Amino acid sequence: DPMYEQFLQRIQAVRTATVAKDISADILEARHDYFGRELCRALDIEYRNNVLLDEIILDVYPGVNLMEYNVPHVTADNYIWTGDMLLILDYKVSVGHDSTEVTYKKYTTLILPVMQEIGINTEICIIRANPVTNQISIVGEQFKRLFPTIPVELNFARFFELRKMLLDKF
Numbered sequence: 572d573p574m575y576e577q578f579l580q581r582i583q584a585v586r587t588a589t590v591a592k593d594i595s596a597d598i599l600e601a602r603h604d605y606f607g608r609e610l611c612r613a614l615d616i617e618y619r620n621n622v623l624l625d626e627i628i629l630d631v632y633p634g635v636n637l638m639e640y641n642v643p644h645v646t647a648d649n650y651i652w653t654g655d656m657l658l659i660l661d662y663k664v665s666v667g668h669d670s671t672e673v674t675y676k677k678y679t680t681l682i683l684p685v686m687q688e689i690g691i692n693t694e695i696c697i698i699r700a701n702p703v704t705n706q707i708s709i710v711g712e713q714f715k716r717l718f719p720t721i722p723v724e725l726n727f728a729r730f731f732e733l734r735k736m737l738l739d740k741f
């Protein structure tokens with residue numbers, strides 16, 4: 572694994588806590604993006620990582636005049652356009668629920684009123700992989716309708732190994 576190799580080299584060279592904390596955050600971000608890619612492959616949807624809300628709206632509603640709607644500058648991992656409803660996608664890889672509750676509050680407060688003014692049915696969807704158990708949790712009723720089964724095959728072992736290696740240096 573080329574990414575694994577880069578991380579191992581960073582872990583070998585690291586000597587301070589600030590850099591060590593940066594490596595760990597980079598491992599988690601790589602694991603998050605790994606899950607996002609595998610999730611999009613399993614659902615047969617286009618993979619994106621980070622898209623702006625105004626770009627989503629311009630994608631699904633090409634003739635929109637954005638200025639009329641006070642569209643905040645806000646990023647999400649991905650979206651699904653069904654032809655009649657917009658699903659905002661956030662991927663998570665976590666054993667807890669807290670980051671889901673923070674993100675859900677943020678997107679429901681920032682995205683849903685704009686889309687309501689536009690008149691486009693929208694749902695905030697958070698798909699979370701537990702990295703310890705490999706269980707998938709979904710927030711988002713219409714997402715669970717469209718995707719009752721998620722044939723993801725996930726292996727987080729490489730990320731656990733790198734984090735353990737970094738932690739074994741303390």
Ligand SMILES: [Cl-]
Nearest residue numbers: 644645646647
């Ligand atoms: Cl944002």
Ligand SMILES: [Cl-]
Nearest residue numbers: 603662663664
């Ligand atoms: Cl995450």
Ligand SMILES: [Mn+2]
Nearest residue numbers: 648661662663
């Ligand atoms: Mn995410």
